[PDB]
Write a protein that binds this ligand. Structure first.
Ligand code: HEM
Length: 394
């Protein structure tokens, strides 16, 4: 809905809304592939959401994703002058070199070692939820299962009392009640906990960050609060939506479902193919300087969207990427991004998927979409299958 600027050839104009639903009834990733296939250039421009460029080829997307010297994490959301400014929060908004010490802190604290006890936490939660609805023979998977996981897991990582789950779920939902008021509510909740752990440190992630340094100086309360929020939100819709694609797929692909049920040792490799097959995140970058790129002039202040989606779905760099194959000898993808801002929660994401797949298949080996209804999907910063119902015998 914005005026076409003088740095945008009309040859690169296309009708793209990252918030608009997938047309009923294409497959989410198929839809994207058609957008990629119809586009006259690898880099197109859309009047929607402030007006912004979109990288529509794999190599291009990964370049914008990773080349911080030209494309900055200063704004990552569209529209830039509403959502982009609204959600800009250090250190995720930082570029290298400044982003370096924070990246280290994020990556080490969400690593395999300090997340070791989380595995039994995910196991007990998954089991309790599944045993809950198993005798009903049906469930809304997104509301009754997927959505019940990430806040509870976050809360065990940072060691917060389970009584606070509804409060925290409500804040995270309303964050993603004016926004600035939600952030204040986040800090009013988190600051006493951080201050309590400065006095009596434990082994949780807040205590670990507190006893860490970045510039050779301690973290401030502001920085630790920012990181807590970003870690809570960062693993919420991502994990819920990923689980949605995974289980709606299993529901349809009976060949795959029956193999995994009859042989759970397939889960480790199936997992790797679920992360390749179903990229969900579309992040963007801000242009800081006038730059010649892709045969056009990128003005300073321009936004460039670089979806993880266009990476693994590019058939000029991937073999039949819509096909779900356990056989795959090559599985390159950027579902977790590329560059300094590569997802530090990727280990947690894979641990969660594994436990969920293992406990689900132990208990409900055979299931499908109720009445084998068609899937419908949404786009956004995190893509999704709209809420679906699963059914199983007894
Ligand atoms: C299937 C699950 C997940 C997917 C697909 C995913 C995807 C991504 C992507 C694409 C990025 C890069 C954003 C960019 O280009 O700037 C990212 C970063 C990030 N993720 Fe994840 N994520 C997942 C799970 C998680 C979890 C479980 C956590 C936390 C426990 C988490 C926390 C974060 C944080 C804090 C960042 C920001 C890194 C930085 O900018 O320094 N994510 N994620």
């Amino acid at each position: 809905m914005t005026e076409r600027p003088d740095n945008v050839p009309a040859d690169r104009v296309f009708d793209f809304d990252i918030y608009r639903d997938v047309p009923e009834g294409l497959d989410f990733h198929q839809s994207w592939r058609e957008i990629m296939r119809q586009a006259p250039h690898p880099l197109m421009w859309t009047p929607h959401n402030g007006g912004h460029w979109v990288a529509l080829r794999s190599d291009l997307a990964e370049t914008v994703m990773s080349d911080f010297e030209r494309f900055s994490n200063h704004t990552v959301l569209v529209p830039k002058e509403t959502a982009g400014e609204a959600y800009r929060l250090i250190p995720l908004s930082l570029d290298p070199p400044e982003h370096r010490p924070f990246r280290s802190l994020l990556n080490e604290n969400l690593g395999p070692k300090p997340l070791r006890p989380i595995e039994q936490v995910v196991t007990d939660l998954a089991v309790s939820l599944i045993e809950g609805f198993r005798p009903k023979g049906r469930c809304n998977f997104t509301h009754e299962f997927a959505e019940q996981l990430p806040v509870r897991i976050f809360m065990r990582i940072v060691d917060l009392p389970v009584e606070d789950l509804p409060k925290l779920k409500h804040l995270a939902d309303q964050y993603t009640i004016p926004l600035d008021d939600v952030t204040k509510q986040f800090r009013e909740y988190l600051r006493p906990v951080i201050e309590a752990r400065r006095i009596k440190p434990g082994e949780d992630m807040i205590s670990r960050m507190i006893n860490g340094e970045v510039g050779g100086r301690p973290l401030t309360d502001i920085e630790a609060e920012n990181i807590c929020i970003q870690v809570l939100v960062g693993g919420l819709d991502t994990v819920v939506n990923m689980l949605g694609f995974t289980f709606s797929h299993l529901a349809k692909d009976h060949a795959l479902r029956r193999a995994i049920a009859a042989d759970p040792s397939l889960i480790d490799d199936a997992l790797l193919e679920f992360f390749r097959r179903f990229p969900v995140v579309s992040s963007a970058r801000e242009v800081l300087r006038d730059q010649e790129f892709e045969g056009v002039l990128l003005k300073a202040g321009d936004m460039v969207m670089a979806p993880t989606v266009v990476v693994a779905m590019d058939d000029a760099r991937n073999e039949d990427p819509l096909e779900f194959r356990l056989g795959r000898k090559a599985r390159q993808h950027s579902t977790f991004g590329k560059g300094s801002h590569t997802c530090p929660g990727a280990h947690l994401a894979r641990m969660e998927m594994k436990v969920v797949l293992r406990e689900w298949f132990a208990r409900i080996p055979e299931f499908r979409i109720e009445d084998d209804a068609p899937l419908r999907y949404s786009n956004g910063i995190v893509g999704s299958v709209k809420p679906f119902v699963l059914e199983w015998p007894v």
